Design an enzyme around this catalytic site. Structure first.
Site, PDB file in Angstrom:
ATOM      1  N   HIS A  54       0.811  -1.209   0.000  1.00 44.03           N
ATOM      2  CA  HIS A  54       0.000   0.000   0.000  1.00 44.03           C
ATOM      3  C   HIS A  54       0.848   1.264   0.000  1.00 44.03           C
ATOM      4  O   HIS A  54       0.291   2.362  -0.110  1.00 44.03           O
ATOM      5  CB  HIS A  54      -0.958   0.001   1.198  1.00 44.03           C
ATOM      6  N   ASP A  71       0.422  -7.622   2.216  1.00 43.06           N
ATOM      7  CA  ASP A  71       0.840  -6.221   2.153  1.00 43.06           C
ATOM      8  C   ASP A  71       2.365  -6.172   2.181  1.00 43.06           C
ATOM      9  O   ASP A  71       2.998  -5.849   3.190  1.00 43.06           O
ATOM     10  CB  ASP A  71       0.230  -5.426   3.299  1.00 43.06           C
ATOM     11  N   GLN A 117       0.401   6.320  10.894  1.00 42.96           N
ATOM     12  CA  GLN A 117       0.514   6.830   9.535  1.00 42.96           C
ATOM     13  C   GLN A 117       1.862   7.504   9.317  1.00 42.96           C
ATOM     14  O   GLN A 117       2.266   8.380  10.086  1.00 42.96           O
ATOM     15  CB  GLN A 117      -0.617   7.824   9.259  1.00 42.96           C
TER      16      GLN A 117
END
Ligand SMILES: O[C@@H]1[C@@H](O)[C@@H](O)OC[C@H]1O
Ligand SMILES: [Ca+2]
Length: 223
Positions: free
Chosen positions: A40, A84, A174
């Site tokens: 991602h 991922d 994040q």
């Protein structure tokens, strides 16, 4: 990194910053010409930045190498973040020393309770927004398969493991995406996803690298 500390300059000599005009994800150098990241975190125009401590200051140990080829795992489901993991190849090899070093892949999966090191340049506030310029670190235990699936019913696959603290206050966030989870000198996890950051009963979920060592080796062996 929420609830962590300041690693120290080049104290994590395999950590990588993926730059497209700006740090957007982290990575882990597994050899002089390959970096493991999170699928991602894919985009075109990735310049791999090694030897970084302060990502806004040239301090004098950095290596800026543009990527030559990206390989997102053949089975990466963006919708579940299953598989991922992606490989990035450098246009030229890295100069490997004490401050730019590769991290060893795992031969066996790490165990719940094992204490791992999670590092990145990601957010530092669970309820807020502040991004560090220097590298931040966290020490976290891998959480049991049962407590992981209980916190994320219907989401956790065999390709994921939870690590962190159920009481909240310490987590990756994040910006740390694609960064290393190193347990006993091996790369066991990749910063993948989670509900918010450092929330109670919502730990970090990390890509189980031990499940991908054969893919990484045979992909590196053909590209
Ligand atoms: O994590 C969840 C994922 O597994 C799927 O259900 O899509 C929505 C997300 O909330
Ligand atoms: Ca720098």
């Amino acid at each position: 990194i929420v609830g962590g500390y300041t690693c120290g300059a080049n104290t994590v000599p395999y950590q990588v910053s993926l730059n497209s005009g700006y740090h957007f994800c982290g990575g882990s150098l597994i050899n002089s010409q390959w970096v493991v990241s999170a699928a991602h975190c894919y985009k075109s125009g990735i310049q791999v930045r090694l030897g970084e401590d302060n990502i806004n200051v040239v301090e004098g140990n950095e290596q800026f190498i543009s990527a030559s080829k990206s390989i997102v795992h053949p089975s990466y489901n963006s919708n579940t973040l299953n598989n991922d993991i992606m490989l990035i190849k450098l246009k030229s090899a890295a100069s490997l020393n004490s401050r730019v070093a590769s991290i060893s892949l795992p031969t066996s999966c790490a165990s719940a309770g094992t204490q791992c090191l999670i590092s990145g340049w990601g957010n530092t506030k669970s309820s807020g927004t502040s991004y560090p310029d220097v590298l931040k670190c966290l020490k976290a235990p891998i959480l049991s398969d049962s407590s992981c699936k209980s916190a994320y019913p219907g989401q956790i696959t065999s390709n994921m493991f939870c690590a962190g603290y159920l009481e909240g206050g310490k987590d990756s966030c994040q910006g740390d995406s694609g960064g290393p989870v190193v347990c006993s000198g091996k790369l066991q996890g990749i910063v993948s996803w989670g509900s918010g950051c450092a929330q109670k009963n919502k730990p970090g979920v990390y890509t189980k690298v031990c499940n991908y060592v054969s893919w990484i080796k045979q992909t590196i062996a053909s590209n």
